[PDB]
Amino acid sequence: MSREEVESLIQEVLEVYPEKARKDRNKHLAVNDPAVTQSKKCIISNKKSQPGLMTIRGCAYAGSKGVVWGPIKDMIHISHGPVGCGQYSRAGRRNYYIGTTGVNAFVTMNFTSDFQEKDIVFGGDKKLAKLIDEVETLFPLNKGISVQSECPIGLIGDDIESVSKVKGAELSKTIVPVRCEGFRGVSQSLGHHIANDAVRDWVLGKRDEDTTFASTPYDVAIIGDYNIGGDAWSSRILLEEMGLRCVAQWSGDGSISEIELTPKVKLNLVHCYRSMNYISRHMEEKYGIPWMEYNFFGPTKTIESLRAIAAKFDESIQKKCEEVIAKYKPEWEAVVAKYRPRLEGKRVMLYIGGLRPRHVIGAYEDLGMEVVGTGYEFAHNDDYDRTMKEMGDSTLLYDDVTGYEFEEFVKRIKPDLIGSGIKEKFIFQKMGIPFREMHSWDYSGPYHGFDGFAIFARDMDMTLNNPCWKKLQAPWE
Amino acid sequence: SQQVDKIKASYPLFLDQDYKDMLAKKRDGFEEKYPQDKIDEVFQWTTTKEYQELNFQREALTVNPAKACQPLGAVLCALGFEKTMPYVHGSQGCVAYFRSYFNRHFREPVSCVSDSMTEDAAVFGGQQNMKDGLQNCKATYKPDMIAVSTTCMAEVIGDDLNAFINNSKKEGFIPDEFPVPFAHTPSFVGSHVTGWDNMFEGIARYFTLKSMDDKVVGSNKKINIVPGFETYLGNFRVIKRMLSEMGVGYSLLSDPEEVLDTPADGQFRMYAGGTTQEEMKDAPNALNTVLLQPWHLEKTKKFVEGTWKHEVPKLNIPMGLDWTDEFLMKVSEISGQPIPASLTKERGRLVDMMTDSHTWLHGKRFALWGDPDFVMGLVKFLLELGCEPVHILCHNGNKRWKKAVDAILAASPYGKNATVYIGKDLWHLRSLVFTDKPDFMIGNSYGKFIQRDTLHKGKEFEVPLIRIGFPIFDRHHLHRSTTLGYEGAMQILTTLVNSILERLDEETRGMQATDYNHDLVR
Amino acid sequence: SQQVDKIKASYPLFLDQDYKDMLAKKRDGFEEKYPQDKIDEVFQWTTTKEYQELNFQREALTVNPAKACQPLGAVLCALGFEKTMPYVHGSQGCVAYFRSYFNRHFREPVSCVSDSMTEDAAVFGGQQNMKDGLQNCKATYKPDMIAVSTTCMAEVIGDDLNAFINNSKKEGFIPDEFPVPFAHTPSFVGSHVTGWDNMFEGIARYFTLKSMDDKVVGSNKKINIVPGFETYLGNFRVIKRMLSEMGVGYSLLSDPEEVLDTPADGQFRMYAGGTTQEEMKDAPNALNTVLLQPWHLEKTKKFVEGTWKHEVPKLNIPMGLDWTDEFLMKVSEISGQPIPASLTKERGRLVDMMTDSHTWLHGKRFALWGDPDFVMGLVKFLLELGCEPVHILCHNGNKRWKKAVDAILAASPYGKNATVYIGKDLWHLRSLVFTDKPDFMIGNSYGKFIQRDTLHKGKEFEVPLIRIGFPIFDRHHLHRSTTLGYEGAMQILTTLVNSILERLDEETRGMQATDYNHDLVR
Amino acid sequence: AMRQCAIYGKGGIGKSTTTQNLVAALAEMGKKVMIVGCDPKADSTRLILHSKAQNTIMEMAAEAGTVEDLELEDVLKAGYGGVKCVESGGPEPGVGCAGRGVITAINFLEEEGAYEDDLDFVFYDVLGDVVCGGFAMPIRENKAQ
Ligand code: CFM
Ligand code: CLF
Ligand code: SF4
Ligand SMILES: [Ca+2]
């Protein structure tokens, strides 16, 4: 597909929209140019969504409770507000963890204040207090409590910060109030931030004067990995086999304690830049700790990262870094040998949140796959910068794409495989185009690391070359 | 590591020694986790009667609810109408979960939109998000009708759906005769089922309120059928089938049975079949209106009896031998069509089955939960089978209901040890199954955990979960099942007896130990 | 002991300490059993590759067959005819097992008689047992027709069914026009499916041989359908349903779908519906005759093509997406009726499902077994799903068949590790599942054991059995299932994927160990 | 209708040749025949197929697994006069009864019914040197009349 051709498409598509919308949308669609280094010159992002267009975006809450906090295993997260939000997100994100559920770990659990006609009327600041006591009594081993506020809290002046301070002090227990009310911001992003800040203000600096923790010149912390299907663990193992010592994981199978010792580290390894760069930049000021972003999607990008990381230490590390790559070379290569053929030349289209849309490209190319179009559901301009460099030439880029939009593009471009969310998975399948949840690994994974890729491949395969696809068209049609 | 020949995924990958020794360090090293022996202590504690008492005293805390908010049902309901696009006036994040939720349960595309209201509207409402919204939607997905619901926000800051809609028409954002029914659906009131009630009602009005003059009860010789919040396709169908087999003219109000099962032929349909608008407009002319799931259609029965002037019967959700009879009968009475040999037989067979395998079901303690009608129908049926529904929980139920159920329980020897609970959640149920242990749980996937827990305490304590309800995510295509009518009875009866036998096999498969009761013929 | 309040049956009664210490004495004291450690030795041995080799070399010994004798099929077949009484000319003991067998599978009353031949007839046949027999039967259960089959004895001493029957008419024991078709069915030849073939053929003749003059192919605009030996009610139905939905005129030859599901209304029916005699008599006038399960209807295809002069098509048992298409098509071609949107959709849906859950089914090794058509259709379908039917066993199959299957396997990437075996029994399969382990077995209840064994070796070795076939006794009402057509595909697809997921849950339910992959959404 | 004959006799005396020519002449007359080599030497078909040495069952079987692992397609060949011929296979030096390799070759042919086929004749070229139970096979199983 030519450049002058793609441009035309976008236009032919926007012809449906009404004036006002047709304009804002035109700004969120572009034809990649690997040359440009400033996104602002072709694609605008992180702006309010147009009403009625069926976006795939979400809200602060999700970006907060479901994205950052919910993952911590030892604390208890309270979905403060009506029952709604709390229920849908329950165990909806496969951010794995190790622990005895209900006793000292609570992730696949739903804690909510369940607001009622009266809690909205007279505020439920009261209930929230009582609640905590009941909490503290029935799940003693909890090492902390959070309060992810849903849409109604901020709208009725309730004041959680107080209750927290009070009850927290009163019980010698940590309690984090989070103003993640859905109406704030326009995506899951503002939630991240709001969340990050919260993390800092009420938890981060809790062990600054405390120096009993024995450190080492090889301590690090993985920031930005949510152990989706075990991603973290697959990444973790490499870093350690590399000799390093990761003190924490944010927030994949992470614990409050692991978070607290984060300042006692030498290097911050950030995966999801968009989700936690906020706490990193901070950690750099209030702790002088350096932070670099890596990527473990596909042998190539992985190897490249492993070294670029070892390069921040001594020989002992950089030697091991090679010992590792060595060990796994036979494996990842053997994989490419089996699947690379079965995929070579197949074009793919993606649309995810704020990192994967680009991070996974490498892995795909490593399998002769061609990403003809990717885009973000809520990424910021700085994300598209890092992006345009990975995406090929004359490719298609879309921000906060609309249901209609995404659907039409696919129809013209006719990708060989679409990787996106669940609110899509089923649409394109009826059109007969293989699909893979790039969000939840389609209940598979992990995809990060070496032992990961193996699967990533195997999967892309099974789904793309599955016979079922050759049967859509009826014989008598 | 990985053997390109036999790749291992998340599981059992992490069972590999290295991963084992990997996580072990991470634990001891930075997790500062409570000594196992404590975790084992605390756990054991929660499985006690003492913990229960403390648990049931909860007032402000709710752990693992068993209900969703109103909009979720308003959406579903709206989906039952030809080219109708569910529109939720409020924050966009909500619609996200809605589609996302249903998709996992139906494994089908759920079409629904939002006028993405934000912070900048928490002061001056969204009289604009509505204007632009309705226009954008109508011109993009070109629906024939747009039903409007609301989210938490929308109601708290209080927006007048009616007004806003009337202005979006006045100011010319959407034609003035373009159907745009509406209903307020506060999250903080009742459960999702309530949404449906409202929504439906909201549509009923929009097509029959301002025009009851030329309407005359019985003029069409049809019976209106309102399914309520139903998530099992097979139901909508069996209803239609039974009636059509009876020669009865019917008008199913709110039929999503088509858009929830669009076929995979190469093209995506965002709409499919469903209750036509004309069907709604005419409804008033129907001989009468039957409510399949009454216990959560009061706001509709009111309107129906009040406006349309229909004599809605006092019928229970048609589940199990008994009630379904009553349903067929009342239907006859109204329509004037005799119960066809066909059904007389289906019934007979349902009975055959019952006798064919009571021996196994007899005296089997169950703990169950779900929605009002569903739950009570399940209870009723278990009694018709000779089981003891010991823990009938129902988070979204009310007192009036609890009574009706107790009445049903009291009318059967098999209801002596039955207890009904409302307002309680799955964390409560968790205890009821430890202290006063049943043999199985009949409920949704959220119950998969309760099982895990019962096992952690021990094999002899594990309580197998029998998925029947909503939502269901850890199994596929069960949404094609059927619970209503005799067809339904049969399915459930089988899903049961077999679940039982299924487990008895597992308990007697032990070689030279218990495999002596591993009979071939059962 | 027993607590009148909570009575324990066989199990777990004998787990009580006293019963434990009770049996313990009995063992040590008088059983002279091999020291455990040996039993453990020998066992382990059988689970080896070495044992397999030795096992497959069996010639004279057969352990745990997977077929029944001919008469069993002649009976079933005969049951598909209006007021027809299956009559087995031979030792009475046989009929005992026959009814007794089917009852366990259908949980319905199987009506069948025997002219109780004894020792005193092993010399002068039973020309009398026939005379009195036919008379007694006819006057007692007053059937409209009596189909005669034979048992092992009858054939060995060799009796001429035809003659004996002709004399029973001549000597006046039963009217001369009373329908009494017959077929020889030697236990020692082929399996039970062969009986059906024979029997059916034997009836076909009795009503069309001596009168092919006024018959003219295509004169009735109908298609005859011969179901063969079918034990899943749901099938007979789906066929009728699909055709009737297609506007095709049909004549199902041998329809026991009614007497195998008589309703429980207070009165016992020994007969119910079934192929009328006139239907058979007229069959010749049918446009053509389709064989649902060809692989075991050769003796009928011959007669059909040979006498009736029909051009029987080369169709495979309609199972799975592909073949069922071909079936519908060929049916169209013949009838001249287009494939209705209805089915075009049912199909599309079947496909939706497939795409909806291939991920889970893909690359799943199965070991299966049963009858020719059934097995091959199962194989075909598993391939359309992306599974690897590794151990296709079929005791009653032949070489010609094995080839056709291998042809089917060779035409698919998913058939690389596939191996077909004929003549082998369940004890062979037992080894195949230990050495080259699959993920599930798809077969009848006889396989419940193989599972036990796979477990005795270890949890990681256990292979879950998925009941689909015949006979089935450890579960209830599965005989109401459906395997043919799209309806069928769906059922199986579900029974599968879910059996899979069902097990994955079990493997990740361990608290703080493997419960991390105990996802809610799958 | 199909006669089952077997030619027995000492080795190294043109037996195999006479036999084959016999079949050949038997072919001209119009009789459809089939030869089954039971001579450990394995050379009872060369003269009909022109081949230097046909593939014995025992060979191709050990290049497939057990027995019914292969198909008559590459075991049974049609040479002059449409004659069908298969060579059993020499017993494994030291281990294996020649007779054994025979039965397995017959029973195989029986299974894929290489017999039921208008055959008027079938000659089992059998070495009758040390007339043991092994070489007696075709007679014991009663396949040779
Ligand atoms: S859509 Fe990651 S910026 Fe966030 S839930 Fe997923 S594309 Fe998220 S990787 Fe993350 S683990 Fe995610 S996949 Fe950054 S945390 S808001 Mo939807
Ligand atoms: S933006 Fe919550 S679902 Fe909504 S109508 Fe809600 S209770 Fe019901 Fe939406 S998800 Fe919740 S209210 Fe939201 S914080 Fe974000
Ligand atoms: S029977 Fe003859 S050929 Fe066979 S093993 Fe004995 S001696 Fe050797
Ligand atoms: Ca679907």
Ligand SMILES: [Ca+2]
């Ligand atoms: Ca019965």
